[PDB]
Design a binder for this molecule. Sequence first.
Ligand SMILES: *[C@@H]1O[C@H](CO[C@@H]2O[C@@H](C)[C@@H](O)[C@@H](O)[C@@H]2O)[C@@H](O[C@@H]2O[C@@H](C)[C@@H](O)[C@@H](O)[C@@H]2O)[C@H](O)[C@H]1NC(C)=O
Ligand code: BOG
Lengths: 119, 119
Amino acid sequence: VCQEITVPMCRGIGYNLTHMPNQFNHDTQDEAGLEVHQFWPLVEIQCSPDLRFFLCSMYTPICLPDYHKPLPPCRSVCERAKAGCSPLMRQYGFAWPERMSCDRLPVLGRDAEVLCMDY
Amino acid sequence: CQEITVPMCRGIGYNLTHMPNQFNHDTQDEAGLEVHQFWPLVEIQCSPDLRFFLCSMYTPICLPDYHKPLPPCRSVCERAKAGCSPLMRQYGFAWPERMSCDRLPVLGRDAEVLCMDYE
Ligand SMILES: *[C@@H]1O[C@H](CO[C@@H]2O[C@@H](C)[C@@H](O)[C@@H](O)[C@@H]2O)[C@@H](O[C@@H]2O[C@@H](C)[C@@H](O)[C@@H](O)[C@@H]2O)[C@H](O)[C@H]1NC(C)=O
Ligand SMILES: CCCCCCCCO[C@@H]1O[C@H](CO)[C@@H](O)[C@H](O)[C@H]1O
């Protein structure tokens, strides 16, 4: 079922409803929120206008009542967030996370059936 | 003029402030005790501009020889508020009238009245 997003950083990014489990097999929004919370300093410095949406699109993925196929962000969204923010993370000892590697995401419009979120 | 010591407002783009502020806080410790109550909102990151906007009022910028207060531009407040007011209202906290945006100058509306913007 669809549930109103309760992860504070992921409200006001363009959609209201999510569903668990997410990509990472978090079972609740609480669990997902406790993890995405750690990215707040990266969102604050604005190394990429895409980062917050990209993160939320994975941690609290959009839920549409009638749609049951996954709606990941598009690869291009990941790539822009990574290009923007990776150097800064790298500068603080953090690598771009394994679970966020962009090549796991669909390319926009490559397959008619495979939809994805652009920003 | 004096070095900024409230932890939230260090490293925000300017280093010096002047007491009293527009809240008639006589010390940075008094000012910081109030602005730190907003700290959870900074970590929530409903707006990247929030911290700068709050600090620009609680630990206002002090400029050598200027001897006059310099407020944030209205647009700075409007971005902070557009991002964070919805979450504050949901959590039962009214956007305080003291940080109303129409109390602040619009950049360039009167060339003689200065304000700080940011990105
Ligand atoms: C996205 O959500 C907003 C806010 O909805 C309210 O808060 C969420 C957490 C739930 O608790 C909802 O039941 C609440 O309505 C929607 O905006 C509101 O819509 C009406 C009721 C109006 O009173 C307005 O002032 C509210 O802000 C918004 O429509 C929704 N977007 C959609 C559905 O596309
Ligand atoms: C846990 C989520 C926190 C939501 C943000 C609340 C920020 C606190 O904002 C509150 O505003 C009021 C203005 O008079 C006063 O009670 C306090 O100055 C201040 O704590």
